[PDB]
Design an enzyme around this catalytic site. Sequence first.
Site, PDB file in Angstrom:
ATOM      1  N   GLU A 106       0.811  -1.041   0.278  1.00  0.00           N
ATOM      2  CA  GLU A 106      -0.031   0.213  -0.147  1.00  0.00           C
ATOM      3  C   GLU A 106       1.173   1.434  -0.206  1.00  0.00           C
ATOM      4  O   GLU A 106       1.978   1.964   0.830  1.00  0.00           O
ATOM      5  CB  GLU A 106      -0.852   0.012   1.130  1.00  0.00           C
ATOM      6  CG  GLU A 106      -2.184  -1.203   1.086  1.00  0.00           C
ATOM      7  CD  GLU A 106      -2.405  -1.553   2.538  1.00  0.00           C
ATOM      8  OE1 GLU A 106      -1.880  -0.595   3.863  1.00  0.00           O
ATOM      9  OE2 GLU A 106      -3.365  -1.470   2.418  1.00  0.00           O
ATOM     10  N   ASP A 112      -6.082  11.237   9.299  1.00  0.00           N
ATOM     11  CA  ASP A 112      -4.707  10.519   9.414  1.00  0.00           C
ATOM     12  C   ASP A 112      -3.956  11.106  11.236  1.00  0.00           C
ATOM     13  O   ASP A 112      -4.488  12.163  11.063  1.00  0.00           O
ATOM     14  CB  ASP A 112      -3.546  11.241   8.498  1.00  0.00           C
ATOM     15  CG  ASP A 112      -4.428  11.102   7.272  1.00  0.00           C
ATOM     16  OD1 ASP A 112      -4.383  11.119   6.207  1.00  0.00           O
ATOM     17  OD2 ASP A 112      -4.219   9.612   7.076  1.00  0.00           O
TER      18      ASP A 112
END
Length: 241
Positions: A34, A45
């Site tokens: 990823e 995040d």
Amino acid sequence: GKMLVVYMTLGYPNVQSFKDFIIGAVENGADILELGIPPKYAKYDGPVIRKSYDKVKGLDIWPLIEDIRKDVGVPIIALTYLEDWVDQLENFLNMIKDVKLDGILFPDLLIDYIDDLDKIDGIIKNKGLKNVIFTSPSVPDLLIHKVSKISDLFLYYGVRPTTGVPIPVSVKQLINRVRNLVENKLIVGFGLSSESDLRDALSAGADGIAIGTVFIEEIERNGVKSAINLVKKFRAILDEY
Ligand SMILES: [Cl-]
């Protein structure tokens, strides 16, 4: 056997060290990569992902994606918010296939675009691309069951975030309660990655685990070669199952 999914922020910490880590990670048993596309805006995040985004601020992202695609042969999934590309979802998916990546994962797909789910899966799938669908404990059980039958490669289930307070329930129990809902392969992703948490997920029937922030931390404190060796360690642990 079990799948080792390895995350890294595109270009972190620098372009050369980033390719070193990716190549080293794949050499030491990463089954899936990823790659984190730095976000056009702020979203869900955590502190260490954000700081990794800080250090690659303004990166020329597409040549690097192309470059790393030539370097490794494992499936590569682009991690980015459907937010940053919904205005331009067509030139994004064509660019993704143009540079030869295998698929995408939109974390905010089931949150902020849940009504667009079936359209967006259809378009991704009719580009030959993989739609890796992100779920989490806050995704209702029947939706998890739904997307488990359409998710490409595997359904992703994220636990133990770095932000907020973790659910004070053992990972073994958390995965017990979704394993029978997911007809796909089940990858459990971790923000914080204790070895007990990882073995709990594998022993509860996960088909692999995804880890990333642990590598960003290991790079900043002991360097790329140390982070590469962590990949070797996680590979051996998954190989016990
Ligand atoms: Cl959690």
